[PDB]
Design a binder for this molecule. Sequence first.
Ligand SMILES: [Cl-]
Ligand SMILES: [Cl-]
Ligand SMILES: [Cl-]
Length: 162
Amino acid sequence: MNIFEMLRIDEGLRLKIYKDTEGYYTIGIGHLLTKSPSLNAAKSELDKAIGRACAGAITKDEAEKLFNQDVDAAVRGILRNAKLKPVYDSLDAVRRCALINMVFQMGETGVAGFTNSLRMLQQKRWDAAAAALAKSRWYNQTPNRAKRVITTFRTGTWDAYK
Ligand SMILES: [Cl-]
Ligand SMILES: [Cl-]
Ligand SMILES: [Cl-]
């Protein structure tokens, strides 16, 4: 299993503009277009991201290209972040993927906000980290996905995804 396969499971794949769990316009494999209520605005962001007139739809290849860009951006955002980097550096390969998953979903700043959980991960207190992560809007809004990531952090294996 790898980060791509993992996020592909959590986010799905849709070739036509859709609303994510918070009602924002997204497309592809979890690629947020805009927070704005306007379908037009969405459509304009899409055209601008792809570089052509998509009329609200993209191809598979296009979806994948955006996904490669988003994953890379998330890894680089972690490595540049003073709060995240040291965590990431302290973790084993499976758990690094769990950290990347959260950044992809909520962004760096959001993740950097889980101060206590970050500190526990770093100290390798897995069960305490799991509990801290669970006490969040994140967990209450998207529980099944949250659980899958938290379990990965707890165990360091891919069972939650197999
Ligand atoms: Cl926390
Ligand atoms: Cl809570
Ligand atoms: Cl969920």
